[PDB]
């Protein structure tokens, strides 16, 4: 980070809203009658299937950020939430795996 040279882990695979844009373009091409790269169409279908998974990952990132904000606020009582932190570390290990 800027002023924090340590690698702040954006812990998640590459998420691009352009995938959603391509899915919308595919739906529009279905609506408007255009032949297209059906390999890309199948990839967009798989991406649409995994889009809820991407949303879950984004929500998990938001939850991690909220936990980080809470920790930054109450570092003085971060030990008070030691059990939740341990559960979160276990979940982080599972998600990394």
């Amino acid at each position: 980070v800027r002023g924090r040279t340590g690698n702040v882990l954006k812990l998640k695979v590459n998420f691009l809203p352009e995938i959603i844009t391509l899915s919308k373009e595919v739906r529009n091409l279905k609506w408007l009658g255009f032949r297209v790269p059906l390999a890309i169409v199948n990839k967009a279908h798989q991406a649409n299937q995994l889009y809820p998974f991407a949303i879950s990952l984004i929500e998990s990132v938001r939850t991690y950020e909220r936990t980080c904000e809470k920790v930054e606020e109450r570092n003085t009582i971060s030990l008070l939430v030691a059990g939740l932190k341990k559960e979160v570390q276990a979940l982080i290990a599972e998600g990394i795996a």
Partner: protein, 48 residues
């Protein structure tokens, strides 16, 4: 005031009961830290 200290301690005890209901992490350590802080406050009160 002795009654004022009793009221403050009653608030502290209610908070302790709430924390026990919380089921958070590091409960005995937090209790010890709170006891030490109360000791510091009481030491100021004792100097007074």
């Amino acid at each position: 005031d002795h009654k004022t200290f009793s009221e403050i301690l009653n608030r502290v005890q209610k908070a302790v009961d709430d924390l026990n209901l919380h089921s958070y992490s590091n409960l005995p350590i937090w209790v010890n830290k709170l006891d030490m802080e109360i000791e510091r406050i009481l030491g100021v009160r004792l100097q007074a």
